[PDB]
Write a protein that binds this ligand. Structure first.
Ligand code: MG
Ligand code: MG
Lengths: 56, 119, 60, 123
RNA sequence: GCUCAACGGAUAAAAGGUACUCCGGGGAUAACAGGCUGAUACCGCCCAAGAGUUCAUAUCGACGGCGGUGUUUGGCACCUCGAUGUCGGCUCAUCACAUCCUGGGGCUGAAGUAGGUCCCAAGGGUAUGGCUGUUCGCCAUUUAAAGUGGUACGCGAGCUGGGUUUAGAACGUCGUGAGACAGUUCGGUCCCUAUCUGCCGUGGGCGCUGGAGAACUGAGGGGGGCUGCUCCUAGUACGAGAGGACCGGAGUGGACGCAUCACUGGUGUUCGGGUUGUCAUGCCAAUGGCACUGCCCGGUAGCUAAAUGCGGAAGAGAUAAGUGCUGAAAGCAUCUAAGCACGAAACUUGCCCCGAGAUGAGUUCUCCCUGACCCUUUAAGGGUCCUGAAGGAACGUUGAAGACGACGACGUUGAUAGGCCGGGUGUGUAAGCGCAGCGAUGCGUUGAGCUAACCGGUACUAAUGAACCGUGAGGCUUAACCU
RNA sequence: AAUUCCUUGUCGGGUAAGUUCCGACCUGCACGAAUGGCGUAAUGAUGGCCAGGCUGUCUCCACCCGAGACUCAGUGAAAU
RNA sequence: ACACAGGUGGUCAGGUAGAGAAUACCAAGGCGCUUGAGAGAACUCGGGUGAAGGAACUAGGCAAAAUGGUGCCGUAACUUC
RNA sequence: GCUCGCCGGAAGACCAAGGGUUCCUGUCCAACGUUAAUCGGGGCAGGGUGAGUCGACCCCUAAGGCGAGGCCGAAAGGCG
RNA sequence: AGGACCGAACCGACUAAUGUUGAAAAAUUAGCGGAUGACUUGUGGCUGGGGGUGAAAGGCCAAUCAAACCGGGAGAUAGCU
């Protein structure tokens, strides 16, 4: 229900051990607008797989 | 478990899943491309990719499921008059999915759904 | 066995209630008079004995 | 599949009308029994003068089940009435004589060659 | 001048109730539970008066005697009163052996059948209801049997709250009374989101001394083990008959557990039909929304049991009790002492599952890497420029895989999903058009129309070029070979 | 007996089985006549007992519909 | 003590169905209630359906299930009529 | 803006009571708002309430309250 | 005609699940009883603590009642922790 002792801050490191983030490995570069974007996602400009998939 | 099943609850009851794809498919036919979330595109691949099966071929009696879960007849007048003859030879796959970043206020994964022959 | 007098853990958590029966005839005899079971068992020894003298008597 | 507390009808001319199973027999911890089976029953309703009496405790064989008995083709045989034929407690033979309604082929045995010979209809 | 007699004498002078209650404190002191103790209790043993026709010792055992158990009632007041929640039930249990069923024996006042008692044996099995807060018990009807105990007389941060044990109320009863009753009867709030330990699952890290992909071996651990009934042997042995077996064999059950959806069903709010009231679609005709899915009627896939397949072994070893064989000590006798055989659901195996973080990190099988230099505290050294393999992860499509993770399938060469065609499937003969009928409605097209998860196909869409990660022949020591 | 200890009194009924209930029995432990007695139609979110109907109460649980739990963002306590 | 599922008096009375100011669906009118978005395990909270059985459950048919309107027929004991 | 959903003898309109700028515009997003907020009953700055007939005041009076004197009471005061 | 009948508002609170760091220092959801009177509800008025009031239970008197609250005696007193 509730603890009987104060937990050690070293345990607090061990509980937060697996709690770390994870960044992106590599960004998919466009081949026409020539810019990095998310793999299997469109660019910021509206490009995907080279072509202009959406006029913004 | 949901072995061999098919259907996402979408955290909504079935009467609202009914009534939401009314307007969502009801406006995609209008503007030919819209911004929605990706599970409301991926469950909508069980919905809108069959809601273009709605858009196959004109009779008189085929004006009616496109009244039924749509409450609309103007969009009926767009489908079999213009879009039926548009997609006259495509045997499936009338759409395309564009995962377009995340929604601001809740980090919801958005996407663009659209038609294949938009231009 | 236990009696079901009022008091609880003085009553129900002890074996203050006795029952003495007969092997060849089958004549039970209980007692729950005082708190002690030997104020009951030995009393139920007397009451079965009081039945026992009547067994020849009621028959005859 | 008849458990306790189950009202059954009567299939012979014994005299009872309503019986009720109080014990499933024939096996250790045997929770259920279908046709071809023996149950201890009481009698809840009888005719004003018959072979029986309201409250007699005796055995019976189960002959018609609403639940169903299967055959090796896959065909399951259900009924619309749950009736039984009353037996002796000791000789364990049927007491009545005139069998009412149809019965099944699972009922036939050396113990029950007697009933099917008196049955009006055997499937 | 005081039974100031509670007699070193609180006052000349003083009774109660409090479950409406309250403070101050106490484990210095009660009630449960633990503790010690074992009187009592329970369970054995010794003696043998005798009973048992005779015959103590088949069965029993007077009078007495000696122990064991902690298990009854107790004793004690050591833990706990700045809290250790108790009766019964329910849910789950697990242990003991002083064994209820099953197993193995010995003796019998054991013809058989059936028992009696004793010993071995704890693998597995070991009722439902009526009564009552129940426990217990009685009873009914089962069963192979309805074991007994340890467990805070197991289990309330799991449930129940009937009983006891608050305040309300009443009777009987007691007291003048307020009130009280191991007297009843009616009514009467069961809190807690889990840090740790423990347990059930499922991951991450690093390790196993080049790296990677696999197959395993199996240390060790777990699961599992019940039984009736019928028939044969056989009316055989036995017995005068009645009755009725051993052993061996077959069949079918019960109960349990695993697997499963072909069947038989349930469910199937996403398939379909019927129908009520209303609202809207200009209006009819049609639909649709809402009314618990509005109310029904049904049904695919899936999931499911009441649906159907297995499962308990046989076998081996070593034995328990027990039976022996040779055989001295002990010219005989003698299962023991030397030797030696048999002997049970216990044991170890045989059965399945887990399993090399088995640090003791094992085994075999396959793939990858044969670039350059500086430094000084010169080595399992540090750094720099080329190189980036096997493969890996990441990302996307996904799953009869899943809380997440992990697992599995697939990423254009491609059937991974979705879509599409084909098919089946199921509601049950659509709409519109005719036709008849005053009409409601019926008939013609008509298993038509529709069709969720499904079966066969189809690249139609969505599964991206890359990049990332991991590198560049792998310590020392002898040893053995080869040169 | 809302009163009876003994006491699950005895008998009858009721049930397969009834420590309950309903009839008697009077042995009233310790009823009793305005702290009224006995009876009483109607009445009762009143007490007990029995039946029919009814059904996941139960045997013996299965399946879906939602709301959380779990995943990700934003925020962000508590007793101890 | 909160932008608190509470409490607070008077006045107002549209349509259809309906005895009705019940209920339903609505008009006028007003809102979608201050975290979302996923996933579709146990597990509770709510719900729906259920083979065969029908109180055996349990302290106790607790809750659920069921009954349900308008006419008409018919209706016992007993009564203080 | 488009549908969709809910309420509708109210989740609509209207007052008293009570609140006392919340009202209307401009501006701002630190805090406040159980998240963001470009928004706000938030901050900031401006506006905005017009009466012979409506309400109060006012004229009456109830329950009542007070009370000249008056009565009573150590005093304070009580009653009227 | 009725301390009549069924039953809205209204008024009460009998059962059950909830909830028990709550939506809420007693509420919701489902039901339930009363619902022309011993009714219910506004606006006021009055009764004050050994007093009030009470179809009475030691009930209620500003979330507190077997002697209200606030101030003072008062640093009550404590052989107790
Ligand atoms: Mg942490
Ligand atoms: Mg002995």
């Amino acid at each position: 229900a509730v603890q009987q002792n104060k937990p050690t801050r070293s345990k607090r490191g061990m509980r937060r051990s697996h709690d770390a983030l994870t960044a992106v490995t590599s960004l998919s570069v466009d081949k026409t607008s020539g810019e990095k974007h998310l793999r299997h996602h469109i660019t910021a400009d509206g490009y995907y797989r080279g072509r202009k998939v959406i006029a913004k | 478990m949901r072995h061999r099943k098919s259907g996402r609850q979408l955290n909504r009851n079935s009467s609202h899943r009914q009534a939401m794809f009314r307007n969502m498919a009801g406006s995609l036919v209008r503007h030919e491309i819209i911004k929605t979330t990706l599970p409301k595109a991926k469950e909508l691949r069980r919905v809108v990719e069959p809601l273009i099966t709605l858009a196959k071929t004109d009779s008189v009696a085929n004006r009616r499921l496109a009244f039924a879960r749509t409450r609309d007849n103007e969009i009926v007048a767009k489908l079999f008059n213009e879009l039926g003859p548009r997609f006259a030879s495509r045997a499936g796959g009338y759409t395309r999915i564009l995962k377009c970043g995340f929604r601001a206020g809740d980090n919801a994964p958005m996407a663009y759904i659209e038609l294949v022959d938009r231009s | 066995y236990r009696t079901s007098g009022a008091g609880g853990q003085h009553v129900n958590r002890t074996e203050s209630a006795v029952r003495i029966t007969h092997i060849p005839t089958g004549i039970v005899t209980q007692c729950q008079n005082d708190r002690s079971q030997h104020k009951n068992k030995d009393q139920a020894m007397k009451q079965m004995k009081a039945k026992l003298y009547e067994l020849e008597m009621q028959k005859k | 599949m008849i458990q306790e507390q189950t009202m059954l009808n009567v299939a012979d001319n014994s005299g009872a009308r309503r019986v009720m199973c109080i014990k499933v027999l024939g096996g250790s911890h045997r929770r259920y029994a279908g046709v071809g089976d023996i149950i201890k029953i009481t009698i809840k309703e009888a005719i004003p003068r018959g072979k029986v009496k309201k409250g007699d405790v005796l055995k019976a064989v189960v002959v018609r089940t609403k639940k169903g008995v299967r055959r090796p083709d896959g065909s399951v045989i259900r009924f619309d009435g749950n009736a039984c034929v009353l037996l002796n407690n000791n000789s364990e033979q049927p007491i009545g004589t005139r069998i009412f309604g149809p019965v099944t082929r699972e009922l036939r045995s050396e113990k029950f060659m007697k009933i099917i010979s008196l049955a009006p209809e055997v499937l």
